[PDB]
Structure formats: structure tokens, C-alpha cells
Amino acid sequence: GEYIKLKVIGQDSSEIHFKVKMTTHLKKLKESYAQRQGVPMNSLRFLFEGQRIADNHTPKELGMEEEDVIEVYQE
Amino acid sequence: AEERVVVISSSE
């Protein structure tokens, strides 16, 4: 399996990029992002093409590709 | 800000 780099855009326009395996559940990206922002994971919602990313969504399931963008909003 | 790339482990 392969890895892709995703760009996570914060409410303040800051970015953290993540190298994620196509089969990894995106809960792990959500946890990492929230840890690095210093906020509870459940205070955030993560969107891809405006649609909510579930904990058990994989990049393969969502059709994600290299350099695709994820947006973070307050829950 | 500097570029930030985090590698997510495949171990869950």
C-alpha cells in the first residue's frame, strides 16, 4: 500500500501536512492534528470537499489523492 | 511558519 500527503487547513489558515497510508483510518489524523493544536479532538470537525470525515473513513474510501486539502472547523 | 509534515503510523 501507498502513502499520500494531505494538507490540513486550520481555521486561522495555518497548515499541517500529513503523510497517511491509503488504508489508515482518518481518526489517526484527527487525533494527531488536535494534539498538535492543543484542543480536544471532539471540539473539531474535519471536512473533505465540504463533507464530514468519519473516524473510520480511509483516504482510499474518500478518493483522496496526493496534496488534497482537508479543512478543519469548530464542531 | 515552517513546513510541517507529520507521518501517521499505520499501527492503530
Side-chain angles (χ1 to χ4, degrees):
Chain A
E2 63 150 353
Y3 272 111
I4 63 167
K5 182 164 75 175
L6 299 168
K7 301 198 206 66
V8 174
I9 301 168
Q11 300 177 71
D12 62 356
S13 256
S14 66
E15 302 180 9
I16 304 181
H17 303 177
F18 293 85
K19 272 191 169 54
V20 313
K21 190 174 154 109
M22 294 297 300
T23 56
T24 290
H25 300 111
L26 285 158
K27 189 188 197 187
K28 309 315 282 180
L29 176 151
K30 304 191 205 177
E31 292 174 334
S32 181
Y33 186 83
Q35 180 191 28
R36 288 162 188 277
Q37 296 295 316
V39 301
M41 204 193 96
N42 69 15
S43 73
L44 303 175
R45 67 194 162 111
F46 297 73
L47 312 180
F48 176 58
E49 300 184 332
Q51 300 248 301
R52 182 176 291 249
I53 299 169
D55 283 356
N56 284 342
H57 275 151
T58 64
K60 174 186 172 188
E61 287 173 326
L62 294 182
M64 288 172 166
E65 293 168 349
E66 176 73 12
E67 297 243 298
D68 270 339
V69 162
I70 290 172
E71 297 178 272
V72 184
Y73 290 85
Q74 283 307 117
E75 181 59 279
Chain B
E2 305 206 349
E3 189 185 42
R4 291 180 288 174
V5 181
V6 175
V7 183
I8 298 298
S9 177
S10 79
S11 177
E12 305 192 5

